[PDB]
């Protein structure tokens, strides 16, 4: 009472039945798996980014 | 053995005698050159081939039988030393045979014989001899066609003997020291080597 | 497999590399009053026969050698199990191998 072992015959039709969908490209992709030492300093760059907010307003006025 | 109708078509990949295909028996054909092999190139100018027309497998049994059928006629019609037959098909493809039949459980068979895969337009057997023996080669190669399956046609090559140069240019290249005979064939001498070899020739 | 009796590995309580005395780990006798042993005895009491499976189809021919490390510092004396790959022959004392010999 043997049967069939492996088949990929009708699988291409099933895959394209709803179409092969790529993940929607999102701005600001996820930062998972990045260097932890790099992520530490990048958090500190955003943590103290408001410290130079007064210099930003002064330099924008020169333009 | 089984009839050649069972192993006539090139149905499988080439299965040579290698470290993986062990236990292969010895082929039926062992001698491929007959007649006066150690003859000069000028001895046998004319050459005739047995060109195939099928993409099939010629058994080593049929290669040996057609070798004898062609040799026994060139000896009787051109003498024992007036020709040089060269069989240009070595049986390398091994045939497999299943056991004397639990039926197909483990059906991969053991080696049975050896065939030579021939192509459409490939030479099977070549005979070189004198020019006046042209009709004898055609008949010798015709009698050996019945020892082969499929369809074969007899062709008289334009080359000079077993060489790869045309007969019209062969005389000119000999005078210009571009071809020198070494036994059954000739060596092509280009002008792209050390000049010391050129001085040795002249 | 031959490992020395002395290692200089990281000591967790000391927080740094320390000389350790390497031994081999033994199972030790099972406590007759373990929770899984107390309920196994109560379940086996009475009629009914064997209530837990009895493993029969053993396949492993070796065991993972467990090394009982121990820092030689008299103040710490902390142990740590260090398991190595499976091996048939395992020796702790042994002797260093020599290349050019007969």
């Amino acid at each position: 009472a043997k049967s069939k072992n492996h088949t990929t015959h009708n699988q291409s039709r099933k895959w394209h039945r709803n179409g092969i969908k790529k993940p929607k490209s999102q701005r600001y992709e996820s930062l998972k798996g990045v260097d932890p030492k790099f992520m530490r300093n990048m958090r500190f760059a955003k943590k103290h980014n408001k410290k130079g907010f007064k210099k930003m307003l002064a330099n924008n006025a020169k333009n | 053995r089984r009839p050649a109708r069972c192993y006539r078509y090139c149905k499988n990949k080439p299965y040579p005698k290698s470290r993986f295909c062990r236990g292969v028996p010895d082929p039926k054909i062992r001698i491929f050159d007959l007649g006066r092999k150690k003859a000069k190139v000028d001895e046998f100018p004319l050459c005739g081939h047995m060109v195939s027309d099928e993409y099939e497998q010629l058994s080593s049994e049929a290669l040996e039988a057609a070798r004898i059928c062609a040799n026994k006629y060139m000896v009787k019609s051109c003498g024992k030393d007036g020709f040089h037959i060269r069989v240009r098909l070595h049986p390398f493809h091994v045939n497999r045979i299943n056991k004397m039949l639990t039926g197909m459980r483990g059906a991969f068979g053991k080696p049975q014989g050896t065939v030579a895969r021939v192509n459409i337009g490939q030479v099977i057997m070549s005979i070189r001899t004198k020019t006046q023996n042209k009709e004898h080669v055609i008949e010798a190669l015709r009698r050996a066609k019945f020892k082969f399956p499929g369809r074969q046609k007899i062709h008289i090559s334009k080359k000079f003997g077993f060489t790869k140069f045309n007969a019209d240019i062969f005389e000119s290249m000999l005078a210009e020291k571009r071809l020198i005979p070494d036994g059954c064939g000739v060596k092509y001498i280009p002008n792209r080597g050390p000049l010391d070899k050129w001085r040795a020739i002249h | 497999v031959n490992v020395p009796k002395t290692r200089r590995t990281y000591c967790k309580k000391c927080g740094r590399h320390q000389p350790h005395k390497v031994t081999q780990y033994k199972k030790g006798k099972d406590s007759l009053y373990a929770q899984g042993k107390r309920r196994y005895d109560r379940k086996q009491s009475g009629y009914g026969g064997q209530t837990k499976p009895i493993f029969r189809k053993k396949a492993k021919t070796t065991k993972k050698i467990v090394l009982r490390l121990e820092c030689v510092d008299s103040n710490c004396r902390s142990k740590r199990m260090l398991a190595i790959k499976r091996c048939k022959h395992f020796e702790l004392g042994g002797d260093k191998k020599r290349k050019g010999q007969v």
């Binding site: 492996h6 099933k14 179409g19 092969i20 969908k21 790529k22 798996g33 260097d35 | - | -």
Partner: protein, 157 residues
């Protein structure tokens, strides 16, 4: 059934080219890979560490993470009907900068230069690439000599 080994079937894929064996040239390690650039993936058998899988050989992705002599690539991998953005970590010996990305960044630098140079002159130049158009009309001089007559040759053996 086949085996699920990591390097199963990579006899010629990860092998070195003919007469290209030996130590890896140094410029392969001197190329800068910033975050977001398009790089190709091609496993090198000389260095077994940080080797990409056989499915990513010949694939292309953008770099998201950069470490010491190793980068992280976001590669697309179509499994059945879902293309998956795979975050793999391969060393720099197995990657090369995609020249297709560099050729596009050069077209932007020229497009921004042409539309700026055309504005200063008032002219309007084209920037969109157009496919090969049908060939325009043209005269063909015979040069006095007639065209060479051709005919099928007879069959020879």
């Amino acid at each position: 059934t086949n085996t699920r080994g990591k390097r199963r079937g990579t006899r010629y894929m990860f092998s070195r080219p003919f007469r290209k064996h030996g130590a890896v040239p140094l410029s392969t390690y001197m190329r800068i890979y910033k975050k977001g650039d398009i790089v190709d993936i091609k496993g090198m058998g000389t260095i077994q560490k940080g080797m990409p899988h056989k499915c990513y050989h010949g694939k292309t992705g953008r770099v998201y993470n950069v470490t010491q002599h190793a980068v992280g690539i976001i590669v697309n991998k179509q499994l059945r009907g879902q293309i998956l953005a795979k975050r793999i970590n391969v060393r720099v010996e197995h990657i090369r900068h995609s020249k297709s990305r560099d050729s596009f960044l050069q077209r932007v630098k020229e497009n921004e230069r042409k539309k700026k140079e055309a504005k200063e002159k008032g002219i309007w130049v084209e920037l969109k690439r157009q496919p090969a158009q049908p060939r325009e009309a043209h005269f063909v001089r015979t040069g006095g000599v007639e065209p060479q007559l051709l005919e099928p040759i007879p069959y020879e053996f």
